[PDB]
Amino acid sequence: MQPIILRTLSARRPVQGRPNLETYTSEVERWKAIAQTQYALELAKEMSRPALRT
Amino acid sequence: SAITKAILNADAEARYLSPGEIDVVRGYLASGERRVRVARVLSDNALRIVRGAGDTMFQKRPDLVAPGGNAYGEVRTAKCLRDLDYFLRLVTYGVLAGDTSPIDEIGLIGIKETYSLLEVPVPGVIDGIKAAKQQAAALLSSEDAAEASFYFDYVISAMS
Numbered sequence: 738m739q740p741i742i743l744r745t746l747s748a749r750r751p752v753q754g755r756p757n758l759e760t761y762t763s764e765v766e767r768w769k770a771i772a773q774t775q776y777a778l779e780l781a782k783e784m785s786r787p788a789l790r791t
Numbered sequence: 792s793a794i795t796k797a798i799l800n801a802d803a804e805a806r807y808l809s810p811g812e813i814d815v816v817r818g819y820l821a822s823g824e825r826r827v828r829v830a831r832v833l834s835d836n837a838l839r840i841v842r843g844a845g846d847t848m849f850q851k852r853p854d855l856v857a858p859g860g861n862a863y864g865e866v867r868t869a870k871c872l873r874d875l876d877y878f879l880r881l882v883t884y885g886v887l888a889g890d891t892s893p894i895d896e897i898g899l900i901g902i903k904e905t906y907s908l909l910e911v912p913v914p915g916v917i918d919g920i921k922a923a924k925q926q927a928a929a930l931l932s933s934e935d936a937a938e939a940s941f942y943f944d945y946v947i948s949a950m951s
């Protein structure tokens with residue numbers, strides 16, 4: 738048994754830990770606000786209807 | 792109305808309408824078609840103006856819809872957009888009526904202490920109203936934009 742066989746090759750990924758996701762989190766909050774606004778418009782339309790005209 | 796204000800001044804002084812009051816009323820009646828045009832443009836685009844105003848105000852102040860914010864939640868954001876729609880409708884009323892009375896009796900008397908009790912941040916309301924003003928001026932010509940901006944700025948000033 739005399740070929741050079743490489744068993745434990747290092748992986749591409751670096752040893753560091755996961756980077757923080759604060760900016761991504763704020764942008765997701767912005768998308769959530771935009772999505773909330775369109776449903777809020779429907780409920781607000783329901784809010785402006787007259788009182789006792791059922 | 793301009794007519795109501797003039798007649799109330801005459802009545803409080805127990806006199807007929809003066810030449811100046813008559814000229815005021817004549818000017819208002821002459822401006823009527825321009826007022827109706829501006830008000831019609833604002834009324835036809837209420838949804839767009841309010842949707843854009845809410846977008847701009849929440850973008851400038853994300854804390855309002857963040858947890859712990861005044862408008863946080865579906866019902867509270869609905870009430871906020873509903874208030875913006877209310878103020879736009881009142882601005883159309885002021886434009887048609889030629890004075891600020893409809894905006895006063897319907898929406899500005901007591902709004903300050905109302906928003907104070909509910910901890911509604913008035914700078915955020917002013918931001919939403921300025922956003923609505925810009926959305927509106929986008930739809931109106933420069934002269935119509937100036938006319939509507941008179942009442943928008945009145946609402947802004949009365950909030951502060």
Ligand SMILES: CCC1=C(C)/C(=C/C2=NC(=C\c3[nH]c(/C=C4\NC(=O)[C@H](C)[C@H]4CC)c(C)c3CCC(=O)O)/C(CCC(=O)O)=C2C)NC1=O
Nearest residue numbers: 855861862867870871874877897898909911912915916919
């Ligand atoms: C037709 C004339 C008229 C006006 C003008 C009016 C304003 C108004 N808005 C209210 C609530 C509210 N108004 C708002 C909107 C504000 N909070 C957000 O942060 C924004 C900064 C801002 C809007 C741009 C919110 C969130 C509430 C609910 C707050 C609570 O439940 O305490 C209330 C208390 C009653 C209710 O809950 O419906 C009034 C009287 N009501 C009227 O009948």
